[PDB]
Amino acid sequence: AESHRLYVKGKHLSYQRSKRVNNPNVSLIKIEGVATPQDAQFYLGKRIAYVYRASKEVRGSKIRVMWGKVTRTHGNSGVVRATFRNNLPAKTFGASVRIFLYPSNI
Amino acid sequence: MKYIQTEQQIEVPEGVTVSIKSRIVKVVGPRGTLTKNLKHIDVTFTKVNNQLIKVAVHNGGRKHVAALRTVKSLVDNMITGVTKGYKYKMRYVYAHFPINVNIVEKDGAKFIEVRNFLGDKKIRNVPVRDGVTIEFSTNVKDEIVLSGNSVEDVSQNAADLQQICRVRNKDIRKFLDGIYVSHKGFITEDL
Amino acid sequence: MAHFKEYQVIGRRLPTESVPEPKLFRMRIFASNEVIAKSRYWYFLQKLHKVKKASGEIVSINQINEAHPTKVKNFGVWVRYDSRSGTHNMYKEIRDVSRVAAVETLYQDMAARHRARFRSIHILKVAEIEKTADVKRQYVKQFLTKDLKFPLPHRVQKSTKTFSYKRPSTFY
Amino acid sequence: TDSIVKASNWRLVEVGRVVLIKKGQSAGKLAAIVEIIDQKKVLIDGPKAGVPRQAINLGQVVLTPLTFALPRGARTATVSKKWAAAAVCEKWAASSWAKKIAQRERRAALTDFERFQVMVLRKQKRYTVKKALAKA
Amino acid sequence: VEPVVVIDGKGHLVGRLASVVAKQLLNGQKIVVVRAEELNISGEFFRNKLKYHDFLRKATAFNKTRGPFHFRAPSRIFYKALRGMVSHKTARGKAALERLKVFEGIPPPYDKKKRVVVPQALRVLRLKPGRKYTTLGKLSTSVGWKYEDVVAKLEAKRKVSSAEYYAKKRAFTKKVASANATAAESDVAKQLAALGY
Amino acid sequence: SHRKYEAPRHGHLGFLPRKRAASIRARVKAFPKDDRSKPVALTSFLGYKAGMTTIVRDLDRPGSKFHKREVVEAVTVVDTPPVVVVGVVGYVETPRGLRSLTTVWAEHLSDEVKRRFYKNWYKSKKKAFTKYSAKYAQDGAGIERELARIKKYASVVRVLVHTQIRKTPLAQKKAHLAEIQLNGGSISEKVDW
RNA sequence: UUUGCUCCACACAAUAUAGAUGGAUACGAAUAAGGCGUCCUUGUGGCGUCGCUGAACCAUAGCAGGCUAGCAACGGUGCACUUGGCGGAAAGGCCUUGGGUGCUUGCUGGCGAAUUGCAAUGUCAUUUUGCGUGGGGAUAAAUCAUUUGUAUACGACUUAGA
Ligand SMILES: [Mg+2]
Ligand SMILES: [Mg+2]
Ligand SMILES: [Mg+2]
Ligand SMILES: [Mg+2]
Ligand SMILES: [Mg+2]
Ligand SMILES: [Mg+2]
Ligand SMILES: [Mg+2]
Ligand SMILES: [Mg+2]
Ligand SMILES: [Mg+2]
Ligand SMILES: [Mg+2]
Ligand SMILES: [Mg+2]
Ligand SMILES: [Mg+2]
Ligand SMILES: [Mg+2]
Ligand SMILES: [Mg+2]
Ligand SMILES: [Mg+2]
C-alpha cells in the first residue's frame, strides 16, 4: 500500500560515554515506542541498519548501509546499546536508524 | 498543620441576589450592582439556601485559612454596600488659613479642588472615583461627604483627599492642618 | 535508618562460677535487621546495667509482628533526642496501622522537623491509645470526627509521553 | 433572580468510596475505603476483586464516582457482604470508564488477521456513512 | 513521531520547557515554539524583574559590544534559557539549534497547524497552587520589549478567525456524529464493536 | 588610586560613534504624534541652507529687563521652493516593527527625480520607471489595487516628495527625494490626499 | 568579449544532503474548574453526558502494488482546468462553483507473479548547478578615467559630463 516498512524507527543518540570520555565502539539507540528496559528486551539481537547516500556509485547503487545489532538495554527509559561492523560516524548523532524484526523469536 | 476543612457563612438579605461562577462574584441589590474577582484565592463557594452561602478551604495551611475570613468580609461589604450603602464624612482642620474645597471639571472630570492649604498658592486636585458622589455637607462647618456602593472606592477616594493635604517641612504635631476622615457609616438611616 | 522490624532481644551477663544463671534482661528494639538490633540492645544495655557485649551473651532474638495489622490505631509516642545545643524529651502522636509503620514516620518526622538523624534519637515508649479523647495533639484528633469526608482538589495526572494534544484538567 | 452559586462537586474520600487501584500487584482492580488514616493514607479492602485488605497511599489509587453504605472499619467478611448487596460491580461495569478500559484490552488482544478484518469493515462502514453525509 | 512539533508556550514554565526542547533537538526533532509572550516563570514579577536587571549590568568594560548581549523579547529570553542547555559552540550544537524556531504570537503557517503542550513543563500541573509566578510578556515589556500591544492586537484578531473555524468544524462533526449513529446497530457496526472498534 | 581632583568628563557619550554619517541627508527618526481629527498635511519639509543675517525686533516678555525694548538677534535662512509629490508608501505594524507594504508612484516623474536614480546620467538610456508608467495606460487596475491595498492595511502613510533643485542657485541638478509622514486624519483620507 | 538574459516545459549530466519511508490531525478560556449534546427566559441559565490521556483519530489489501470484466451505488478521491470569495504577523495559503478525466478494496469475476535460488537498504526522497534544444517574455547599468568641493591622510563621500 502506502506503507512498505518492515522495521522500527530509531535514533542514533550518543556513543557510550563518561562525562569527559566516549567509546566509539558502542552506540546508544533510542527505539520508537520503547519506554522501559523491559519493553527493550524484545529487541536485543535484532539487526540494525544505518542507511545513507553517496556520490560514487559503487556496486551499482548510490546508497550504502552500515550494519549492526542491538546488544543490551541501557538505563531505565528504554534506550538500547548496539554495536556495528564499523563504528558509526558521529555526525549521525540524531540521525535515523532502522531496527528490523529479525532474527525473529515470535 | 493543614486543617482539613474550615468554612464561613455569608448571610444574604431579602433584597439581593449574589451569583458566582469561577470565583467571579456578582452581588446585585436595591442600590446597584457590584462585582469582584476572587480568582487569586482558591476557596470553594457553596449555595445552601437563597439567604445563605458558604465558603470553605480544604486541606489548608495557616496563611490559607487566614484568607477565608477576609473573603467572607469582602463579599459581605459587597452585600451591605449594595443595600445600605457607604458614607464617609471628613472635616477640614486648619488653625489660620481656611481650606477652600470645590469641585471642578476638565474634559469630563469631576476633580476635588483644594485651595489655600496652609496658605499655599498651589492648587491641589484629587479625582472623583467613578461610583462615588461628593456632597459638601450643608449645615455643618467644613464637612465633606463621600458616599457610594463600594467601600473600597469610597474609603480610597477619601484617603486620596486626606493625603494630598500632608504637611511638609513643619512639626506636624503643631501644624495639624488637613482634611481628615471624621466618621465612617452607612447611607440609609436607622441602620 | 531503613524499613523497620520490631525485635525482642534478650541477654544476660556470662555465667560465673559463683553467679550461674544471671538475671536475663529484655528490650524491644526497632531495627531493619537482627545485626543492628543486637547492636542497639548492647547500646542501651550498657547505658543501664554493668555489662558490655564482651562480658554478656545474647540469649534470644525474636521478631514481633503486629497483632492486628489491618486495624487503624492512634499511637502515642515518647522520645528523647539531641539537638545541636541540647538534649530534649518529646511526646508526639502518630496514627497508622502498625507500630512498625509508626516508628518509620516518627524517624522521618524527627529528621524533617527537628533535623535529628537516627543516631540522635531514643524511642522511649510506643503505646496504643485505647480511648479517644485521651488523644492529645490535634493533627490527629482532626481525623477522629464522625462521618468524616474530604475531597482532593486540583489533581495532577502523571503523563507518560512528553507531548500532549489536549491541555489538562485538574478536576476530580 | 435566584442566587446561583456553581457546583464544583468532587469525589470524596469517605468510608465506602470505591477506588480503582492504578499500580501494583492489584492494579486495575476495584476496592473500597474502609477507615481513613490521614490526608494521604487510607485503609482499603478489595475482597471481590481479590485485593488484600491493606493500608495504601491515596496517590496509588484513583477515586471513582461510585459509593455504597459501609460501616467505618468494617471487616473483610462484612465488606464483601455489603459490596454484593450494593451491586457495585454491575454498576462499575456499566460505566463508560470501565467500558473504555475493556475496549482497549480487546484491541490489544487482536490477532494480525483480526486487524486485517477490522480494516475491511471500516472500509465498508465508511462507504455508507460518507454516503449519508452527502444526502443531508 | 512528527516531522515538526509546534508547542504553544502559554502556561509553560521557562526552564522546564527549555529543558525538554533542548533534548528533543539533540535527538533530531524539529521544534517551533509559539506564544512565547504567554510563557511563565516561577516567583513573583518583582523577583524576576530584579533578576533581569542583575543580568543587565554585565557588560564588557572596555567595549559594551563584545560584552554579553541582552535580548528583551519573550522568544529571545526563552532562546537564552534553551541555548544554555545546548553545547552551542560545537557543530553538533549549532546543528541542533537550527532545528528550532521561537515566536511571540502565532504567525502564519503555524496558526493553521495544530499545536501541542508539554505536561512536565505545564505550570498548572507543576506549580503548587498558591505559589506566585510571572508572565514573560509583562517581564519583557518592563525591560524594554516594544511589541506587546501589536502582538496582543494581532492575536485578538487571529483568535476571532480561529473561533469561526472551530464553530464550522464543531457543526460538521455534528453531522458526522448523526450519520455515524444511523449506521449504528447495523451488521458491520456490531462486528466492529466485537473487535474493539 | 583616585583622581585627586574631580572634574566632569569631556564630551557626550550619547553622540558616539563619532564617524562620518552614512549620507548627506540626515534621516528623520521620529514624526509628530498623529492627531487624526485635523486636516491632512505634511509633517516636514525639505530645503537648502542659504546663510544667516541679523534682525531687530521688540521683545514681549513681561518681567524681563528687556520687556518692550528692542533686541538684535541672529537668524538663518533656508531656501524652500515648493516640494513635489511623486508617491505614497503604506506601512503596517508587525511584532518585528514597522514594515513597508507597498509604494505607489506618480505616472510622470521629473528628470530632477529621475536623475537621483542614476550614478551616470549622460551615458544612460534613462529607462527608469518607463515600465511602471505603463500601468496607468491600462484602465489603472494595478495602481488602484495597490492604492486599495494601502487603505485596507497600513497603520501609517507617507508621501514621497522631492525638491525642485532647478529653482535653486545650486549647480547640482540632482534632486532630493524623501518620505514625509501624513498626520492629517483617517488612513483612507490620507492616501486619497 | 563570439548569441547573451529571464520565466514555463524535458532532456542529459553532474553535485550534493545534521538524515522522507502512511498523516505536523488549527477554538478560546478556566484549572477550588471545564468540553460536548439538548432545551429555553439567551443567563455567572435548566437538564443530560464525558474525562481517569494520542493505547486516539484518519489512512491502510492490489508487480513499490501489473493487465483486465461486471455489479451496486450518485458516494469518495487524484489531476489539470473553470466560478465566486477569503487571508498582509512572515498573507504566497484556505474556501467555494461547474463540467472533463483517472482510480476506487462498497461487492463479485478472469489473467499474471517462480530461477532475485534460505538474509545482504536491495535503490522509489530533494539540494544546488552545468550543457545543448523551443514555447512565451524583456532589450540595462556600474566601474576606471575626467570633473565639483557641501568631502577627503590614501581609499571613501558629494557633483558634473553625447
Ligand atoms: Mg577528567
Ligand atoms: Mg520632619
Ligand atoms: Mg523647621
Ligand atoms: Mg493497539
Ligand atoms: Mg553603575
Ligand atoms: Mg574622588
Ligand atoms: Mg506587494
Ligand atoms: Mg549536512
Ligand atoms: Mg455548547
Ligand atoms: Mg448550563
Ligand atoms: Mg482524538
Ligand atoms: Mg489499484
Ligand atoms: Mg481482483
Ligand atoms: Mg515562518
Ligand atoms: Mg535558450
Short mmCIF file of N, CA, C and O in Angstrom, two decimals, chain D residues 55-130:
data_model
loop_
_atom_site.label_atom_id
_atom_site.label_comp_id
_atom_site.label_asym_id
_atom_site.label_seq_id
_atom_site.Cartn_x
_atom_site.Cartn_y
_atom_site.Cartn_z
N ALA D 55 -3.17 -1.09 54.04
CA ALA D 55 -3.01 0.35 54.08
C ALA D 55 -2.42 0.77 52.75
O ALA D 55 -1.59 0.07 52.20
N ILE D 56 -2.85 1.90 52.23
CA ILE D 56 -2.38 2.31 50.92
C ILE D 56 -2.29 3.83 50.83
O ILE D 56 -3.01 4.56 51.52
N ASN D 57 -1.38 4.29 50.00
CA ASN D 57 -1.27 5.70 49.73
C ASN D 57 -2.38 6.12 48.79
O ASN D 57 -2.71 5.37 47.87
N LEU D 58 -2.97 7.29 49.01
CA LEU D 58 -4.07 7.72 48.16
C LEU D 58 -3.61 7.88 46.73
O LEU D 58 -4.37 7.65 45.80
N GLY D 59 -2.35 8.25 46.57
CA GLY D 59 -1.80 8.55 45.27
C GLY D 59 -1.60 7.33 44.39
O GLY D 59 -1.22 7.46 43.23
N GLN D 60 -1.81 6.15 44.96
CA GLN D 60 -1.63 4.91 44.23
C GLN D 60 -2.94 4.40 43.69
O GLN D 60 -3.03 3.33 43.11
N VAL D 61 -3.97 5.21 43.90
CA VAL D 61 -5.33 4.78 43.75
C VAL D 61 -6.11 5.96 43.19
O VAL D 61 -5.78 7.11 43.47
N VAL D 62 -7.10 5.70 42.35
CA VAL D 62 -7.91 6.80 41.83
C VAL D 62 -9.37 6.64 42.21
O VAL D 62 -9.99 5.60 41.98
N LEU D 63 -9.91 7.69 42.81
CA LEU D 63 -11.28 7.72 43.30
C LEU D 63 -12.31 7.62 42.16
O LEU D 63 -12.26 8.40 41.21
N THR D 64 -13.23 6.67 42.27
CA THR D 64 -14.35 6.55 41.34
C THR D 64 -15.58 7.31 41.82
O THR D 64 -15.68 7.65 43.00
N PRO D 65 -16.52 7.60 40.91
CA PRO D 65 -17.82 8.16 41.27
C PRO D 65 -18.70 7.26 42.15
O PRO D 65 -19.63 7.77 42.76
N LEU D 66 -18.40 5.97 42.23
CA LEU D 66 -19.23 5.04 43.00
C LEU D 66 -19.03 5.09 44.53
O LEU D 66 -17.90 5.21 45.02
N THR D 67 -20.14 5.00 45.26
CA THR D 67 -20.13 4.79 46.72
C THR D 67 -21.21 3.83 47.14
O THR D 67 -22.18 3.64 46.42
N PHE D 68 -21.06 3.24 48.32
CA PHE D 68 -22.07 2.35 48.88
C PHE D 68 -21.99 2.35 50.40
O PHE D 68 -20.97 2.73 50.97
N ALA D 69 -23.06 1.93 51.07
CA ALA D 69 -23.12 2.06 52.53
C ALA D 69 -22.16 1.10 53.22
O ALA D 69 -22.31 -0.11 53.11
N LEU D 70 -21.21 1.65 53.96
CA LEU D 70 -20.23 0.83 54.66
C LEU D 70 -19.98 1.38 56.05
O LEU D 70 -19.79 2.59 56.22
N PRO D 71 -19.93 0.50 57.06
CA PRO D 71 -19.55 0.95 58.39
C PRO D 71 -18.08 1.26 58.41
O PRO D 71 -17.31 0.47 57.86
N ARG D 72 -17.69 2.38 59.01
CA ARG D 72 -16.27 2.67 59.16
C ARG D 72 -15.61 1.49 59.85
O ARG D 72 -16.15 0.96 60.81
N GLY D 73 -14.47 1.05 59.32
CA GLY D 73 -13.71 -0.01 59.95
C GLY D 73 -14.32 -1.40 59.80
O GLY D 73 -13.90 -2.32 60.49
N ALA D 74 -15.29 -1.54 58.90
CA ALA D 74 -15.93 -2.84 58.64
C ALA D 74 -14.93 -3.84 58.12
O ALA D 74 -14.15 -3.53 57.23
N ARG D 75 -14.97 -5.05 58.67
CA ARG D 75 -14.01 -6.10 58.32
C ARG D 75 -14.31 -6.72 56.96
O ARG D 75 -15.31 -6.37 56.32
N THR D 76 -13.45 -7.64 56.52
CA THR D 76 -13.50 -8.15 55.15
C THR D 76 -14.79 -8.90 54.84
O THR D 76 -15.43 -8.64 53.82
N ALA D 77 -15.17 -9.82 55.72
CA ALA D 77 -16.45 -10.51 55.57
C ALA D 77 -17.59 -9.52 55.37
O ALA D 77 -18.38 -9.64 54.43
N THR D 78 -17.66 -8.52 56.24
CA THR D 78 -18.70 -7.51 56.16
C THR D 78 -18.65 -6.75 54.85
O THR D 78 -19.68 -6.51 54.21
N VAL D 79 -17.44 -6.37 54.45
CA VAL D 79 -17.25 -5.58 53.25
C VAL D 79 -17.74 -6.36 52.05
O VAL D 79 -18.47 -5.84 51.20
N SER D 80 -17.35 -7.63 51.99
CA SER D 80 -17.76 -8.48 50.88
C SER D 80 -19.28 -8.56 50.81
O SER D 80 -19.85 -8.54 49.72
N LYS D 81 -19.93 -8.62 51.97
CA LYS D 81 -21.39 -8.71 52.03
C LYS D 81 -22.07 -7.44 51.54
O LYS D 81 -23.02 -7.51 50.76
N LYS D 82 -21.60 -6.28 52.00
CA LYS D 82 -22.23 -5.01 51.63
C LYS D 82 -22.03 -4.69 50.16
O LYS D 82 -22.94 -4.16 49.50
N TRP D 83 -20.84 -5.01 49.65
CA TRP D 83 -20.47 -4.81 48.25
C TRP D 83 -21.46 -5.50 47.31
O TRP D 83 -22.07 -4.86 46.44
N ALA D 84 -21.63 -6.81 47.48
CA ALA D 84 -22.52 -7.59 46.63
C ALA D 84 -23.95 -7.09 46.77
O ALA D 84 -24.66 -6.95 45.78
N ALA D 85 -24.34 -6.82 48.01
CA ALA D 85 -25.65 -6.24 48.29
C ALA D 85 -25.89 -4.99 47.46
O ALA D 85 -26.96 -4.81 46.89
N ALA D 86 -24.88 -4.14 47.39
CA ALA D 86 -25.00 -2.86 46.71
C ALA D 86 -24.88 -3.00 45.20
O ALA D 86 -25.19 -2.06 44.47
N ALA D 87 -24.43 -4.17 44.75
CA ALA D 87 -24.27 -4.47 43.32
C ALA D 87 -23.30 -3.52 42.62
O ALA D 87 -23.56 -3.05 41.50
N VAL D 88 -22.17 -3.23 43.25
CA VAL D 88 -21.29 -2.20 42.74
C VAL D 88 -20.56 -2.66 41.48
O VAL D 88 -20.19 -1.85 40.64
N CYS D 89 -20.38 -3.97 41.33
CA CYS D 89 -19.67 -4.48 40.16
C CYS D 89 -20.43 -4.24 38.86
O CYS D 89 -19.85 -3.82 37.86
N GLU D 90 -21.73 -4.48 38.87
CA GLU D 90 -22.52 -4.28 37.67
C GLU D 90 -22.58 -2.80 37.38
O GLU D 90 -22.55 -2.37 36.22
N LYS D 91 -22.64 -2.02 38.46
CA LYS D 91 -22.67 -0.56 38.38
C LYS D 91 -21.41 0.02 37.72
O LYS D 91 -21.49 0.91 36.87
N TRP D 92 -20.25 -0.51 38.12
CA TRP D 92 -18.96 -0.14 37.52
C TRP D 92 -18.87 -0.58 36.08
O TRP D 92 -18.61 0.22 35.19
N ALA D 93 -19.12 -1.87 35.85
CA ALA D 93 -19.08 -2.45 34.51
C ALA D 93 -19.92 -1.65 33.51
O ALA D 93 -19.60 -1.60 32.32
N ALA D 94 -20.99 -1.03 34.00
CA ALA D 94 -21.90 -0.24 33.17
C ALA D 94 -21.33 1.12 32.80
O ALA D 94 -21.85 1.78 31.91
N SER D 95 -20.28 1.54 33.49
CA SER D 95 -19.77 2.89 33.28
C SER D 95 -18.95 2.96 32.01
O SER D 95 -18.34 1.98 31.58
N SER D 96 -18.94 4.14 31.40
CA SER D 96 -18.17 4.38 30.21
C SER D 96 -16.70 4.12 30.52
O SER D 96 -15.97 3.52 29.72
N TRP D 97 -16.28 4.58 31.70
CA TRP D 97 -14.93 4.35 32.20
C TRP D 97 -14.51 2.90 32.03
O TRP D 97 -13.59 2.59 31.28
N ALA D 98 -15.20 2.01 32.73
CA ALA D 98 -14.93 0.59 32.66
C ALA D 98 -14.99 0.08 31.22
O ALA D 98 -14.15 -0.73 30.79
N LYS D 99 -15.98 0.56 30.46
CA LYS D 99 -16.16 0.13 29.09
C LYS D 99 -14.98 0.56 28.23
O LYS D 99 -14.54 -0.18 27.36
N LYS D 100 -14.48 1.76 28.47
CA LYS D 100 -13.34 2.26 27.73
C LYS D 100 -12.14 1.34 27.96
O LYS D 100 -11.40 1.03 27.04
N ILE D 101 -11.97 0.91 29.21
CA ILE D 101 -10.87 0.04 29.61
C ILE D 101 -10.94 -1.31 28.92
O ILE D 101 -9.95 -1.77 28.34
N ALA D 102 -12.12 -1.93 28.99
CA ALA D 102 -12.35 -3.23 28.37
C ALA D 102 -12.16 -3.15 26.86
O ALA D 102 -11.72 -4.10 26.22
N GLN D 103 -12.50 -2.00 26.31
CA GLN D 103 -12.40 -1.76 24.89
C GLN D 103 -10.95 -1.85 24.43
O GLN D 103 -10.64 -2.56 23.48
N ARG D 104 -10.07 -1.14 25.10
CA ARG D 104 -8.68 -1.11 24.67
C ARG D 104 -7.97 -2.44 24.97
O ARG D 104 -6.98 -2.77 24.33
N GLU D 105 -8.47 -3.19 25.94
CA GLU D 105 -7.93 -4.51 26.21
C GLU D 105 -8.25 -5.48 25.06
O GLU D 105 -7.43 -6.32 24.70
N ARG D 106 -9.44 -5.34 24.49
CA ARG D 106 -9.83 -6.10 23.31
C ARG D 106 -8.93 -5.77 22.12
O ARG D 106 -8.45 -6.66 21.43
N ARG D 107 -8.72 -4.47 21.89
CA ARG D 107 -7.84 -4.01 20.82
C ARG D 107 -6.45 -4.61 20.91
O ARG D 107 -5.86 -4.98 19.90
N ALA D 108 -5.92 -4.71 22.13
CA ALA D 108 -4.56 -5.17 22.33
C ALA D 108 -4.43 -6.66 22.06
O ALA D 108 -3.36 -7.15 21.71
N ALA D 109 -5.54 -7.38 22.22
CA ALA D 109 -5.54 -8.83 22.07
C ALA D 109 -5.70 -9.26 20.62
O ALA D 109 -5.61 -10.45 20.30
N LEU D 110 -5.95 -8.29 19.74
CA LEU D 110 -6.21 -8.59 18.34
C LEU D 110 -5.04 -9.27 17.67
O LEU D 110 -3.88 -8.88 17.79
N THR D 111 -5.40 -10.33 16.97
CA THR D 111 -4.57 -11.07 16.04
C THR D 111 -4.28 -10.25 14.78
O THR D 111 -5.05 -9.36 14.43
N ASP D 112 -3.16 -10.52 14.10
CA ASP D 112 -2.86 -9.79 12.86
C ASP D 112 -3.97 -9.95 11.81
O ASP D 112 -4.33 -9.00 11.12
N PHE D 113 -4.50 -11.16 11.69
CA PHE D 113 -5.64 -11.41 10.83
C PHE D 113 -6.82 -10.53 11.25
O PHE D 113 -7.41 -9.82 10.42
N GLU D 114 -7.15 -10.55 12.54
CA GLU D 114 -8.28 -9.77 13.06
C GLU D 114 -8.14 -8.28 12.73
O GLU D 114 -9.11 -7.63 12.33
N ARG D 115 -6.93 -7.76 12.89
CA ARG D 115 -6.60 -6.40 12.48
C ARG D 115 -6.96 -6.17 11.02
O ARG D 115 -7.58 -5.16 10.69
N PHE D 116 -6.60 -7.11 10.16
CA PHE D 116 -6.95 -7.02 8.75
C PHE D 116 -8.47 -6.96 8.56
O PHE D 116 -8.98 -6.18 7.76
N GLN D 117 -9.21 -7.77 9.32
CA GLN D 117 -10.66 -7.78 9.20
C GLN D 117 -11.28 -6.47 9.67
O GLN D 117 -12.23 -5.98 9.06
N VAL D 118 -10.74 -5.90 10.75
CA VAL D 118 -11.17 -4.60 11.24
C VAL D 118 -11.05 -3.54 10.15
O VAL D 118 -11.85 -2.61 10.08
N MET D 119 -10.06 -3.70 9.29
CA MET D 119 -9.80 -2.74 8.23
C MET D 119 -10.80 -2.87 7.10
O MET D 119 -11.32 -1.88 6.62
N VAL D 120 -11.09 -4.10 6.68
CA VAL D 120 -12.06 -4.30 5.61
C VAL D 120 -13.44 -3.80 6.03
O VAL D 120 -14.23 -3.35 5.20
N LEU D 121 -13.72 -3.87 7.33
CA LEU D 121 -15.03 -3.44 7.83
C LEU D 121 -15.12 -1.93 7.89
O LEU D 121 -16.15 -1.36 7.56
N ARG D 122 -14.05 -1.27 8.31
CA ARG D 122 -14.11 0.18 8.38
C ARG D 122 -14.26 0.74 6.97
O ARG D 122 -15.03 1.68 6.76
N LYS D 123 -13.59 0.12 6.00
CA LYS D 123 -13.81 0.43 4.59
C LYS D 123 -15.30 0.40 4.26
O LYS D 123 -15.83 1.28 3.56
N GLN D 124 -15.98 -0.62 4.77
CA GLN D 124 -17.37 -0.85 4.43
C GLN D 124 -18.25 0.15 5.15
O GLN D 124 -19.14 0.74 4.54
N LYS D 125 -18.00 0.34 6.43
CA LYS D 125 -18.79 1.29 7.21
C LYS D 125 -18.60 2.69 6.65
O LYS D 125 -19.57 3.45 6.55
N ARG D 126 -17.37 3.04 6.28
CA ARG D 126 -17.09 4.34 5.69
C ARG D 126 -17.89 4.59 4.42
O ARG D 126 -18.40 5.69 4.21
N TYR D 127 -18.01 3.57 3.57
CA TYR D 127 -18.71 3.75 2.30
C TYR D 127 -20.13 4.27 2.48
O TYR D 127 -20.54 5.23 1.81
N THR D 128 -20.89 3.65 3.38
CA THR D 128 -22.30 4.02 3.55
C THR D 128 -22.48 5.32 4.34
O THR D 128 -23.46 6.04 4.12
N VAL D 129 -21.57 5.59 5.27
CA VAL D 129 -21.71 6.78 6.11
C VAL D 129 -21.41 8.03 5.31
O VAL D 129 -22.21 8.97 5.30
N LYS D 130 -20.27 8.05 4.62
CA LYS D 130 -19.96 9.16 3.73
C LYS D 130 -21.12 9.42 2.77
O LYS D 130 -21.43 10.57 2.47
#
